[PDB]
Design a binder for this molecule. Structure first.
Ligand SMILES: [Zn+2]
Ligand SMILES: [Zn+2]
Lengths: 185, 77
C-alpha cells in the first residue's frame, strides 16, 4: 500500500506507532513539564515481517533544565534493551515552553540515531502550544550537513533545510496497538 | 592490525580496523571517521562493562573478532 523513500531514493520500512504514545508520554512526564523541565524517552520495539513496531516507551535515567534533557546512565539503558531484545527506533521529548521544532541539540542527537537506522524518528511535544511533530533529517543531505557541522554553541542555527516532518501518509503509521511504559528513573 | 565489531541497538553491525594499543578514545574517533557519530555521544560496552576513554583495548585484553556494543547518549533541547 505505501512505499516510502528517503530524499536519496532509499526505501524506508514502516514504523507502527501506537496512537496513545504521545498522550501517555505527556501524562507520565507531566510533573517535570509543570516544573518547566524537559524530559526524554526512547521509542523501543521490534522488527517483524520487514516492519518496525514501537512496543515500549522507555524513560531513562536523565537530567534536565528548561532548555535541555539528557541520559545519564546509558549502560543501564543498554542492559535493559539488551535483556528484552528491544531495538532503538527513535526518541521523544518535551518542549515545556517552546514551539514545536527540532533544535540544534535535537538535530545533532537525531543525526546519529538516523545514521544507525534510516527509519529513526524524533517526536517533539510542545504542550504549552498544544502542538507536536514527528521529524527526521533529510537523507542524505541533512545528515551530511550535521555530520560535518563544527559550528560552536549549544544552540547554534543551521543554514539550509536540514530536517523535515514525516509525510502523511508515509513510513510512520499511527495505529491502535498496545503500549508499555518503562520508567527506569 | 586487527578487526573488531561494533554492534548497535538498531540491528546494525560496524566493522573497525584497530590495534591493541588503541585507546577507547581512539576507537571512538575511528567510529566517527567511519560512521559520522561524534565521540562524545558514544558509550561502548563490553562484557557487562562500560569501557573508559583512557584505557586501551590491550588493557581490557580485547581480542580480534571481539564485539563491542554501542549505546548512544541522548540529548534533547
Ligand atoms: Zn550544528
Ligand atoms: Zn527539542
Amino acid at each position: 500500500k505505501i512505499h516510502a523513500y528517503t530524499e536519496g531514493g532509499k526505501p524506508l520500512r514502516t514504523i507502527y506507532l501506537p496512537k496513545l504514545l504521545k498522550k501517555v508520554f505527556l501524562d507520565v512526564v507531566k510533573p517535570n513539564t509543570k516544573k518547566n523541565l524537559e524530559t526524554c524517552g526512547i521509542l523501543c520495539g521490534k522488527l517483524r515481517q520487514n516492519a518496525f513496531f514501537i512496543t515500549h516507551l522507555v524513560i531513562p535515567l536523565q537530567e534536565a533544565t528548561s532548555d535541555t534533557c539528557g541520559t545519564t546512565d546509558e549502560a543501564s539503558l543498554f542492559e535493559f534493551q539488551d535483556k528484552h531484545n528491544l531495538l532503538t527506533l527513535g526518541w521523544i521529548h518535551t518542549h515545556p515552553t517552546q514551539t514545536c521544532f527540532m533544535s540544534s541539540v535535537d538535530l545533532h542527537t537525531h543525526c546519529s540515531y538516523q545514521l544507525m537506522l534510516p527509519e529513526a524518528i524524533a517526536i517533539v511535544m510542545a504542550p504549552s502550544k498544544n502542538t507536536s511533530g514527528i521529524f527526521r533529517l533529510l537523507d542524505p543531505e541533512g545528515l551530511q550537513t550535521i555530520v560535518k557541522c563544527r559550528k560552536p554553541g549549544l544552540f547554534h542555527p543551521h543554514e539550509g533545510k536540514v530536517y523535515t516532518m514525516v509525510a502523511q501518509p508515509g513510513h510512520v503509521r499511527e495505529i491502535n496497538s498496545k503500549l508499555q511504559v518503562v520508567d527506569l528513573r | 592490525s586487527m578487526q573488531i565489531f561494533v554492534k548497535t541497538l538498531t540491528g546494525k553491525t560496524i566493522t573497525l580496523e584497530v590495534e591493541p594499543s588503541d585507546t577507547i578514545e581512539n576507537v571512538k574517533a575511528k567510529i566517527q571517521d567511519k560512521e559520522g557519530i561524534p565521540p562524545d555521544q558514544q558509550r561502548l560496552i563490553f562484557a557487562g562493562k562500560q569501557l573508559e576513554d583512557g584505557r586501551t583495548l590491550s588493557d581490557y585484553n580485547i581480542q580480534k573478532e571481539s564485539t563491542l556494543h554501542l549505546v548512544l547518549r541522548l540529548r534533547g533541547g
